[model samples]
Target chain A: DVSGTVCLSALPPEATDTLNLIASDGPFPYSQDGVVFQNRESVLPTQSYGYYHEYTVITPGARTRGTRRIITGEATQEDYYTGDHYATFSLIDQTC
Target chain B: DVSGTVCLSALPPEATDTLNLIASDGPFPYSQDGVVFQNRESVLPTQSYGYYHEYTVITPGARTRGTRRIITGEATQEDYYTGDHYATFSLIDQTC
Candidate 1:
């Protein structure tokens, strides 16, 4: 819902795929996929406890749940991407 | 556990008490306390699912679960603190 956010499809292919999967609500990859992010760093804007959710970005030819991920807000699908883990986040502007 | 990490007690008074509470394995404060903190941000070092947990810091003067928080790694208690939600995490070194 915030401005100056990154467009959903504008991300890399791997990230976009996962971002879209979130669009369709996949059976997700890891059991931890939709787990509560808990915003400990408070890097992104603040919201209620359950407001944000995380999904893996699926690294190809990589081992163990890789580093890339996407954090999404509820229902409206406000999403954010982090290539370098949680140190930084780019708001995923779905344009929805 | 990790080098260059933070000290647990050195955190603010409110945060220190909660950190100690996790020492006793309370009956934590919020219903969401001790919930699985899926590391969506990948900010912290990688660990398997259920490797991490989060607790509210209980800001004294403010309402609505303010920003301060602590995310703890299990068993030996590798703890991390964040006043800004989850953007940045400093490992809490507990000589406790």
Candidate 2:
């Protein structure tokens, strides 16, 4: 049993372009183990309560970091709700 | 339930700086769920433990966030040896 979260902080400008976050969860992308979240969308996060979300480097550059706060929230009770989650992420993107 | 391992490591100077780690088990990767490790030419430090492994992220961001890790290690007497699992991660990275 495992459960937890990984959070990233947005930079000062707060990502002025398209910022994509994908959670291919549960081992594979086809198994529907996870979901895709865009800025300002809402859907309860699912899976386990304390799990690590895996990420890979693709762009191949300087961090490619952002400042917006993004996260994966977990809710207990599988077999109970195959895709059962209760929280959502709303990206408050602003330009300084 | 399920069972297995997952680990991460460094891109050896011996690696000629060409290195990568990917895990596509269980869910979408192909309905299998399991491990991926690489470091100084070594596997994950905490090897052989956990339900399985899964990872994805085309670029900077990742699934490494707020979520669950129930692990699905329930593959017990039901034959977990088929792969049940043991623990979380062991990441080792370096800059050359």
Candidate 3:
């Protein structure tokens, strides 16, 4: 398993919950939740097409889903968190 | 008219091409080109839902579209450019 840069323990409570759901592979809230990430910006290290998939993190009290995101690699071991949509990303390590 | 922070003339040549297409209501290159941009991250100033739409800016020689993007407001007056795929943005003012 690959090691992510940032530990999940440092992330928000919502992120922790999302990661668990991702581990179980079920019950995504939105239809667009698990769509391909299309890492157009090249922010994260390069990977093959379809290597990355995206999930949403709920933003409280917002009319629409907020920009916070969790992007996972095919193995689901390498997870990334981007609170600013795709502008910046932090690798998420599930094991603290 | 809403004044975007950045000016178009300062943008790259490809951006000019895309802006023209937007003005003429083209003829966009991608099927998902003109989709509604949900500003979930709250990076840009908050606006009502459906206020923004996103379009792709071609990267020189990548197999897939690169991270570059042009997000235009509903009035088509304000524009934002992000080379790093929404990691950061600069407002694009059509009339330089």
Candidate 4:
């Protein structure tokens, strides 16, 4: 049932741009945009504590971090995007 | 880094056999062999309730189910063999 996957090219431009920011470790728009995602929900693949980092995808005029996020994994070197907070995730397919 | 991975043939024969049983939904040797793993430590890839199942590898001569175990994922259909209980895991690769 965990077939949720999305092509990187298929993601929103904002999400892709956020991915670029992550690769460069650039300055984030929000304070908590580049923080270690504790992965409290345990939805992603397992790894060390700091293995997962999250960047906020601005929701435009939400005036907050918003519920959309891109969680990049250091271990898996894979990325996951979630629109409804951490309730669900779609594995980012870079080769797509 | 989560590079730990093992080929299916690399696993002990018991683990391989257990994998087959899981596929066949056959009888288990122990009552606790086919119980729902809570993923309490968040070691393996995450999923919903009953998404992860643990099976004893039957470490022989130990007179009991040893720490060695196999965790099968329902959503991913991915198998993981853990010799140290849930301390660490190596994703089982069936391709090899």
By TM-score, who's the top model here?
Answer: 4
Q: What is candidate 1's lDDT per residue for A1-96, written digit by digit as tens? A: 233467766776678767767878886657788888998877877879998889998664454677889888775657788877787788876663
| lDDT (tens digit, per residue) of candidate 2 on A1-96 | 112321223332211111232332324212222333331222433344344221221221222221222333332211111111223233222221
Consecutive 10-residue window with the lowest summed lDDT within model 3 chain A: A1-10
The Cα RMSD in angstroms, rounded to one decimal, for candidate 4 relative to the true structure is: 15.4
When summed lDDT is taken over every stretch of 10 residues in candidate 2 chain A, the lowest stretch is A77-86
Q: Candidate 2 at B86: error in angstroms?
A: 22
Model 1 Cα shift for residue A50 (angstroms)? 46
TM-score of chain A of each: 0.81, 0.19, 0.87, 0.85
**Superior candidate under TM-score, 1 versus 4:** 4
Weakest lDDT window of 10 consecutive positions for candidate 4 chain A: A57-66
In model 1, what is the error at residue B44, expressed in angstroms?
A: 0.8
Better candidate by DockQ, 2 or 4: 2
- TM-score of every candidate: 0.49, 0.16, 0.49, 0.50
User: What's the CA RMSD for each of the models?
Assistant: 15.8, 19.3, 15.9, 15.4
Candidate 4's docking class is: incorrect
**Residues A1-96, candidate 3, lDDT per residue (tens digit)?**
123478888887889888877878859887878888877655665567788999988887777879988989876477889888877888877778
lDDT of each: 0.76, 0.25, 0.78, 0.77
Write candidate 4's Cα lDDT for B1-96 as tens digits: 124888888888888888888888879888998899877544554345688888988786898688888888875657788888677888888787
DockQ of 1: 0.02
Please name the candidate that would achieve the greatest lDDT relative to the true structure. 3
lDDT of 3 at A9: 81
Pairs clashing in candidate 3? A40-B67, A66-B40, A67-B40, A67-B41, A87-B86, A87-B87
